[PDB]
Amino acid sequence: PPSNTPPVKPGGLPLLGHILEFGKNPHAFLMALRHEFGDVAEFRMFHQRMVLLTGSQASEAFYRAPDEVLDQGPAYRIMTPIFGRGVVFDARIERKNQQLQMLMPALRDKPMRTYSEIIVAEVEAMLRDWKDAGTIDLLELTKELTIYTSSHCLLGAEFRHELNTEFAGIYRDLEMGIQPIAYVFPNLPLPVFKRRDQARVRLQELVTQIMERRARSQERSTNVFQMLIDASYDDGSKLTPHEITGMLIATIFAGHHTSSGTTAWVLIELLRRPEYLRRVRAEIDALFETHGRVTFESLRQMPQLENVIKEVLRLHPPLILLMRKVMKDFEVQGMRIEAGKFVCAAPSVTHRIPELFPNPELFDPDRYTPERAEDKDLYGWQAFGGGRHKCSGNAFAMFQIKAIVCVLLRNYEFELAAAPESYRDDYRKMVVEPASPCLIRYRRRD
């Protein structure tokens, strides 16, 4: 007599499964799915069967699964042309995991103090252009700021200066090549696709030249690029330009809209909540009488602003569907999920479970005080996912976001240009961010 399996939601369309109801609003869909069917709930995108894993226990089984059980490969087939064949998430488990392990130390610890200064510098620089007052699209601001700081830190000064223009064009041409038909199709050829391919080729060209020029010279800059040059596999072999190029692109895509979206939300949430705006300004102003400048050591200790970021990430996790292929029958909360099926964690859903986050719809940074529960379940809060494939860039992200917010708020008053309740997540975007017309006003402080 066969074994307990997850409940399946009624079918919808025979060609399409539930994808149309899903695509309408993905957060609503997944919220409804869990509400009706619980922690482990099956639906079907097209032919494929997805099982939504929400709550502490189901989340745990997801993040703690071996790579042999849950494969993250097929999430990113859309990206494989951008990243490169046989490059991270297109490589074989062992080679993949070494490449990821090369990134980890490039994004924490030793280079973090340099990264801080670069980020602060870049924001200071952009602010000098600014009029005494005006009206900006906040999401355009944070997207610029994040790509300038990202690229300076991950790629190096060359890409901010000499290769500024060219890289800009390359990035959008790579960006544009993220079409959903690419994921759906094994397919690759189209007009926008050769533009995507030409851009990858040009970037690898530019990476190769810079390896050689840095080597011809003796400059030893601090960026992920440099550290990937200086890295090696366990057998002593080196990364190729193909591999360095893919790994750097993956890192920039990983961090760009995620950061920029989160930064935008931190400002919006503060701007519609004066009590927290006051707490954060107080902290920032205190920093400046304590350090006199934004410093790596000062960024490490900003509890009020950390806690705001954490709560913004609870209520606005920029990645809302983390997908895996099941490669081996595995069992979650006494139900069996067969190989061939897919399985996905849903931050935006699990973050809104009352038993984990009392009064889930309320914005409350004080959830994360030592008195109150933050990590106490390490698979509740999961904006950076979890387990072996937790965000590498989470420390980088936190410093970047803190740095940007300090400098902006220290120098500039802001206010929303539209009704507070009108700023909403656009759940239709591949990386969830605030809805695109997102106007804000500014005025030099004092």
Helices (H) and strands (E) in the chain, counts: 17, 12
The label of the residue with tokens 């060219």 reads 166
SS3 for 338?
coil
Q: How far is the CB of 419 from ligand HEM (least distance, A)?
A: 27
Nearer of residues 204 and 392 to ligand HEM, judged by Cβ: 392
Find the shortest distance in angstroms from Cβ 166 to ligand HEM.
22
In whole angstroms, what is the distance from residue 217 CA to residue 203 CA?
21
Min CB(319)–ligand HEM separation in Å: 4
- Which helix (H) or strand (E) segment is 272 a member of? none
Q: What is the DSSP string of 244-262?
A: HHHHHHHHHHHHHHHHHHH
For 378, counting Cβ atoms within 10 Å of its Cβ (0-12 exposed, 13-18 middle, 19+ buried), the class is: middle
Q: Which is nearer to ligand HEM, 226 or 251 (CB)?
A: 251
Q: Which residue has the tokens 């980088």?
A: 396
**Cα 219 from Cα 180, distance rounded (Å):** 41
Binding site for ligand HEM (CB under 6 A): 72, 100, 103, 107, 251, 254-255, 258-259, 262, 313, 317-319, 322, 383-385, 389, 391-393, 396-397
Taking the mean position of all CA atoms in its chain, how far away is CA 12?
32
Residue 404's identity, in one-letter code, is I
Shortest distance, position 34 Cβ to ligand HEM, whole Å: 18
Supply the minimum distance, in Å, between the C-beta of residue 322 and ligand HEM: 4
Beta strands of 152-213 (E only): which ranges?
Answer: none
Shortest distance, position 355 Cβ to ligand HEM, whole Å: 22
For residues 227 and 254, which CB has a smaller minimum distance to ligand HEM in the complex? 254
CB of 254 to ligand HEM, least distance (A): 4
DSSP 77-133: TTTHHHH-TTSTTTS-HHHHHHHHHHHGGGSSSTTHHHHHHHHHHHHHHHHTT--SE
Q: How far is the CB of 446 from ligand HEM (least distance, A)?
A: 31
Closer of 33 and 383 to ligand HEM (Cβ)? 383
324 is in an annotated binding site: yes
Structural tokens at position 3: 């074994």
CA–CA gap between residue 151 and residue 160 (Å, rounded): 7
- Our CA dihedral for 403, 408, 410, 416, rounded to 10 degrees, sits at -130
As a whole number of angstroms, the distance between CA 343 and CA 337 comes to 8
Residue showing the smallest CB distance to ligand HEM in the complex: 393
> Is 389 annotated as ligand-binding?
yes
Which of 93, 181 has the CB closer to ligand HEM? 93
Q: How far is the CB of 114 from ligand HEM (least distance, A)?
A: 14
Judge whether 72 is annotated as a binding position: yes
Nearer to ligand HEM, 5 or 296 (CB): 296
Residues 27, 346: Cα–Cα separation, whole Å? 9
Return the CA Rg of the chain. 22
Decide if 414 contacts 407 (C-beta within 8 A). Answer: no
Question: Is 153 annotated as contributing to ligand binding?
Answer: no
- Nearer of residues 193 and 385 to ligand HEM, judged by Cβ: 385
Q: How far apart are CA 330 and CA 214, in angstroms?
A: 49
Shortest approach of ligand HEM to residue 290 CB, angstroms? 26
Residue position matching structure tokens 């897919």: 342
Residue nearer to ligand HEM on the CB measure, 123 or 383: 383
Strand-strand pairing, 50-53 and 40-43: antiparallel
- Our CB check for ligand HEM shows the closer of 144 and 212 to be 144
Compare residues 222 and 392 and give the one whose CB is closer to ligand HEM: 392
Answer yes or no: are the C-beta atoms of 366 and 372 closer than 8 Å: yes
**What tokens appear for 190 in the block?**
């189209």
State yes or no: 98 annotated in a binding site: no
In sequence order, the 6+-apart residues with CB closer than 8 A to the CB of 436 are 139, 426
Known binding positions for heme: 391
Known binding positions for heme b: 72, 76, 324, 389, 391
Known binding positions: 72, 76, 324, 389, 391
